[PDB]
Amino acid sequence: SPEFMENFQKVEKIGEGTYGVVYKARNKLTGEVVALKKIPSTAIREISLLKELNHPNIVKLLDVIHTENKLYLVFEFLHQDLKKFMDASALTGIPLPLIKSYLFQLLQGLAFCHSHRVLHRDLKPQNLLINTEGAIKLADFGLARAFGVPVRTYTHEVVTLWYRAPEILLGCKYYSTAVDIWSLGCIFAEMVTRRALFPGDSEIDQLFRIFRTLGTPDEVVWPGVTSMPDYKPSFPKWARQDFSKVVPPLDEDGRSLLSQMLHYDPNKRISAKAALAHPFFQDVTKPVPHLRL
């Protein structure tokens, strides 16, 4: 129980993050309710720079606390994540106009962070946070560069592979902002269909799940793929399936954008900036979700 917790009133455990426990806490002096995440000199420098990466669709990093050889991150608090909202919305699904709003906003957050040379690398429904005003925000940007993405959390929970880009799974050392577009495409598909697109339960099952839907990649669609560290010539050769079968009832505008977000070649994959200009967003609005808190 470090002395700095004296700065807070209610310090209640609300969840189990990738790196440590997550608390809800109130600052006694300011009265602000925050998320306190419990988590090495390069990491300190990397994480401190994120205090100046502010955008409406990024969960704000308020403070870094290093004390008693322990590290704590103070973030802005939001009441719900997209995973719990997706579960809550399962009988009738999230309305298309709200999916569209959510995707548009998340692309804005990506476009901002990518323009500043920051990656997420571990996007997933549980780190997309929503509020009652129709906003959505990405949580934990930049943390992967600072402290890695482990196989198992501090609690031994399996870190999900479902949203992981194929270049990561094939051993690319120097993957970049396209990995976040891939993850967001997978999330888009899940919002539309109400089921995970590629729910792999090991690295090879993840890769084979992708291959069975999008086709086994080859040098025609992905120049250089056969020379990637973890590519094997013995991978089965699956034909690619129509998105009309993959994400019904999404319209041609949404299927076109999704196909561009899920291109194998990371240089071909659409950027966040270019995705914002896609015809799918011509009629975007900002609806208010029904939240029960």
Ligand X SMILES: Nc1cc(Br)ccn1
Nearer to ligand X, 77 or 222 (CB): 222
Q: Give the torsion sign (CA, 49, 55, 56, 57).
A: negative
Is 141 a residue that touches ligand X (CB under 6 A)? no
Task: State the Cα–Cα distance between residues 237 and 214, nearest whole angstrom.
Answer: 11
Nearer to ligand X, 99 or 161 (CB): 161
CB of 223 to ligand X, least distance (A): 19
The answer to the question of whether 76 is labelled as a binding residue is yes
C-alpha 265: how far from its chain's center? 20
Return the residue matching tokens 């949404």.
254
> How many residues belong to the site for ligand X (CB under 6 A)?
6
Is 164 a residue that touches ligand X (CB under 6 A)? no
Is 174 a residue that touches ligand X (CB under 6 A)? yes
Is 100 a residue that touches ligand X (CB under 6 A)? no
CB of 201 to ligand X, least distance (A): 23
The answer to the question of whether 167 is labelled as a binding residue is no
Whether 201 is catalytic: no
Nearer to ligand X, 101 or 271 (CB): 271
Largest CA distance in the chain: 62
Nearer to ligand X, 59 or 123 (CB): 123
Return the residue matching tokens 């099952």.
205
Is 175 a residue that touches ligand X (CB under 6 A)? yes
CB of 149 to ligand X, least distance (A): 8
Nearer to ligand X, 167 or 190 (CB): 167
Among 37, 124, 145, 278, binds ligand X (CB under 6 A): 145
Identify which of 149, 13, 136 has the alpha carbon closest to the alpha carbon of residue 86: 136
- The one catalytic residue in 63, 87, 122, 205 is 122
Among 119, 170, 189, 262, binds ligand X (CB under 6 A): 119
CB of 175 to ligand X, least distance (A): 5
Residue 259 three-state SS: helix
Write phi, then psi, for 35 (nearest 5 degrees). -100, 125
Question: Got the DSSP string for 66-130?
Answer: EETTEEEEEEE--SEEHHHHHHHTTTT---HHHHHHHHHHHHHHHHHHHHTT-------GGGEEE
Residues 6+ apart with CB under 8 A from 207: 166, 169, 170, 200, 235
Nearer to ligand X, 146 or 262 (CB): 146
Residues 180-239 within binding reach of ligand X (CB under 6 A): none
Q: Which run of H or of E encompasses 246? A: helix 243-246
C-beta of residue 158 within 8 angstroms of C-beta of residue 151: yes
CB of 119 to ligand X, least distance (A): 5
DSSP H helices, 162-225, are 166-169, 178-193, 203-214
Is 121 a residue that touches ligand X (CB under 6 A)? yes
Write phi, then psi, for 26 (nearest 5 degrees). -110, 130
Is 146 a residue that touches ligand X (CB under 6 A)? no
- Which residues are at the interface with ligand X (CB under 6 A)? 119, 121, 144-145, 174-175
Q: Which residues are annotated as a binding site?
A: 14-22, 37, 76-78, 81, 124-127, 140
| Catalytic site positions | 122
Q: Which residues are annotated as a binding site for ATP?
A: 14-22, 37, 76-78, 81, 124-127, 140
Q: Which residues are annotated as a binding site for Mg(2+)?
A: 127, 140
